[PDB]
Paper text:
Here, we investigated the biochemical, structural, and dynamic properties of the enzyme complex responsible for vitamin B6 (pyridoxal 5-phosphate, PLP) biosynthesis in S. aureus, which comprises enzymes SaPdx1 and SaPdx2. A multimeric assembly of two enzymes, Pdx1 and Pdx2, synthesizes pyridoxal 5-phosphate (PLP), the active form of vitamin B6, as well as its vitamers. Pdx2 has glutaminase activity, converting L-glutamine into L-glutamate and an ammonia molecule. The latter is delivered to Pdx1, which synthesizes PLP using ammonia, ribose 5-phosphate (R5P), and glyceraldehyde 3-phosphate (G3P).
The structure was solved by molecular replacement with an AF2 model and refined to 3.0 Å resolution. The asymmetric unit was composed of two SaPdx1 monomers, but the H32 crystal symmetry readily revealed the dodecameric structure of the PLP synthase enzyme. Two electron densities were identified in the P2 phosphate binding site, and the densities were modeled as phosphate molecules interacting with R138 and R139 from the LGEAxRRI sequence motif. Additionally, an ethylene glycol (EDO) molecule was observed to bind to the active site of SaPdx1 close to the catalytic lysine. For one of the monomers in the asymmetric unit (chain B), a hydrogen bond was clearly formed between K82 and the ethylene glycol molecule.
Author numbering:
A (entry chain B), D (entry chain B): 17 to 47, 55 to 272
B (entry chain A), C (entry chain A), E (entry chain A): 17 to 48, 56 to 272
């Protein structure tokens, strides 16, 4: 879809323009801790869409059918059934396959990833620890999903079903993963990316892109931090450029 | 009995008038950690009744026979044996069949629903989490009741009795539910409805109506907010109209 | 329905004739650690029916619809869904209301009694400890049912529902028991009756009749023993006659 | 496949001929308690196949690839990955989809049934308690599978995935069951069928046929018992004929 | 090192000759609740060596340095530090790298396999359940080792050390296994092989050979049975030939 890029969380049109100028592959509209966290007001989403030409994403509460249907009616590119917001259903997720708009979901293991894909998700990402600035949770989630997938690619067929039963995964999804040799969708790194070295590390661990952001607007030079993150996600093994960019922050 | 409507909590005559002008099917008279919560003063109920022509409802403490009989003598349309008030009897509910006025009660599963119906309740609603603005508990209760009813409609006869024994439901009530194919009374959504998307979501889950709290008057434009809630409860699948209405809140 | 009588377990035509001559109100056809206990062969039931003019009863495994339907097609008077046989369904009993022949079931408390009645049982009896000769369990079950019924007859209405919820009884059945002032069906004593004093004691506790096992034919004079059991079940307070009859055993 | 019939376990050519004369839809070749229970000698299977024209089945140890491949090379119609035999793999079942011969497996719940179907089973049956003559286990397994399937046919889509996760079932199998309205394969009753009334009961509970046998050869008139079981499996609601046939055993 | 062969347990010269005539790649000298199991008498080992030209193996107690050194001085080809004998050291195994003769050891997982290899073992085999005739434990051990090796071959480098730390394996041994892509020594199947189908199944699971116990001589035709075992271990996918050979046993 949009592999190799950086996704930023914007709060107005100015931050969206700064993101487009920095080289972000997509934007995420959002309005922070306390109370109930619901979807953003449609005016903010419409402003974010009118501000940039890059695809704009919006978050919806888990299991909230109406929020996702409203974001779909608005013409949003992708919808993020985000656990960042206060969930709406603590038992059942959205049946994203019944939707026209593609969906991105969070996961921490191959079981969660397979359950989200079977529910109709088009894109995946790590849950991480959003708002903490700590990359350890995203690292753990990425490494767990990748190790389980590597096991599944070289697992004996006779042992696949049991494996699913042990991790709560749909059998057909695991068979598809084994036949294709990798995840059928892209898996991004989200929650915890604070420095461009964090984005480079997540891309070195085998991520298909960086999803976290929001904090880039808090720096003394927000545009500089955004450009540094975007340039560190791409060509993540050029350490000299990474150090040079980090020196100017 | 008047399914598909919106019921609002009012505290004075002005709120009752505003709710009537918004298009609410009925009103609920209320007074206000909060100490002991009892029934409202009869003067406030009389004011609410004289303010609007729509049916007026009043809350009574659980198991408080005298409060309910007084509200019946006052001429209220429906009485809510509401757990939101400090209960008066923590072991037995009132014998609603021995009353002349209809009753609405809260429930979280088919067992509680059947226990309330067997006692003579004329209406049901989810308990939810009142005052929290989170529709999680209402969603959970509605889904649980709907799932147990779906079980009961297509269940073998030999397995009905034990089912009642396992859920504390009256046997004849469960047999009637199986024979009719649905609940004998309407089931509304209550506690947690914060946005028009929440009302549309509760109606999408199969509710027969929504109960709005006092937060509807907390908006900058309470009249517009109440109108949006009403217009979203009706035609709950028109997601474009829901998004348009929410853009103005 | 024929209250105050004695029911005897017979295995052939001679035993049925001897029980008829003793004055038993009905007979029970039987075949025999004992492996699996199923219904008796239809030939033995037909022999028992052709041997005596009194009503003949046959036992069926719990939840075994086919055994009960076969016994109904054979023309049996009553069917005993007896736990003394190896049960066929350990979760659900047969829907006795959907049958044409009346049923007698075992019970140890008002909850089991009400569950059996709600399923359509026409008669009740204590489970006891069959084959032990000890009337302890029959006494216990009879006293428990009588105590719970005495509670229910003089209990407040508001406390009925919870009571059902606490004992697994159908609400309408408990309401009917409260309104009528007694059990809707007769309750017999079964399992443990060894001496005529045991039958007189079960009748003193408020039973509507006694079920005699196979030990009645184990005496040196089986006819005299059966006659003593019958003469003690009737006029159970004539202690001098009971002692006289027991002196000859 | 072969719905409505009775399957018998034969040990030689004479019992297979008696089964074919009785009206069995298929035969099961077998050679009993103690030690290790493996597949039968190929000579016995070849004799059973040469004795009758009805399809012949053979049992293989669970997870034993070579035993099933040998039975497939022999030209056996169906293979029974039977838990009756001492298992060969206590973790992983055979991938029956990779086979040409159709497979029949045992199950006790919708989870096991879905795991067996996803593994490539063409036919199902209850595990029961083989060799005990007690129908209670088959009754429990049949009722559990049927109740879970009835739930699944009327379950909300948004709740399906979670349901699978709760029972360890493949998501696609459950979706297929919901879309078709029933199990995609036939579900037979096995283990415990001792009397023709047991077969009639299993068919009244919603089974697609009777699978248990073996014991029919132990009666005084084995041919008579076999004919009675075959006639009771078909037209299971003719209770008069069932009683007549049972009277002659 | 001589992969794909069959190793047989012999007790005299006649058994060694019969095993050689059957086509076994090597022989195992043995003597016999059974008290204490020690190494065999040197006279029996010398007899077995003089009887056949194939390589002869002898078992030694675990950690018994002197037994192994004596067997080395006797001129044995391979030594089996077999747990089937009563161990002499329950804490430490012998330093096989300090010996001149090659060693074969038992294992149940990659941890035990790596611990044995690091100590200098030249060959591996499953522990199984010797004397039971049940291939369950051999299947389990083989599948566990194969699964852990499949994990290790496609595992990230950063995750290797911890993996060793979590399984008690030497780090350099695991690195060598990852670099070579397979085990550094052959892994045989042992303990539980009862039928030629069992040998074919162990070879299908990826074993490098089978260890036959003493039951091969318990058949009515021991020579035919041993020939069938050998002919099934080789070309283990020719299921028609396996069935034909088994038909004669
Ligand atoms: Cl917070
Ligand atoms: Cl045994």
């Amino acid at each position: 879809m949009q592999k190799g890029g950086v996704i930023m969380d914007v709060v107005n049109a100015e931050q969206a323009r700064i993101a487009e100028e920095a080289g972000a592959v997509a934007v995420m509209a959002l309005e922070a801790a306390g109370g109930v966290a619901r979807m953003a007001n449609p005016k903010i989403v419409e402003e974010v869409m009118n501000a940039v030409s890059i695809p704009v994403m919006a978050k919806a509460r888990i299991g909230h059918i109406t929020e996702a249907r409203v974001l779909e009616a608005m013409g949003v590119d992708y919808i993020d059934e985000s656990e960042v917001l206060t969930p709406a259903d603590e038992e059942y997720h959205l049946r994203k396959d019944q939707f026209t708009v593609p969906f991105v979901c969070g996961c921490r293991n191959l079981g969660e990833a397979a359950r989200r894909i079977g529910e109709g998700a088009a894109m995946l990402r790590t849950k991480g620890e959003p708002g903490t600035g700590n990359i350890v949770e995203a690292v753990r989630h990425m490494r767990q999903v990748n190790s389980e997938v590597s096991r599944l690619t070289v697992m004996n067929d006779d042992e696949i079903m049991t494996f699913a039963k042990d991790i709560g995964a749909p059998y057909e999804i695991l068979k598809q993963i084994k036949d294709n040799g990798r995840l059928p969708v892209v898996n991004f790194a989200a929650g915890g990316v604070a420095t461009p070295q964090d984005a480079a590390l997540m891309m070195e661990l085998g991520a298909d892109g960086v999803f976290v952001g929001s904090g880039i607007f808090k720096s003394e030079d927000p545009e500089k931090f955004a450009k540094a993150i975007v340039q560190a996600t791409t060509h993540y093994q050029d350490y000299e450029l990474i150090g040079r960019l980090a020196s100017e922050l």
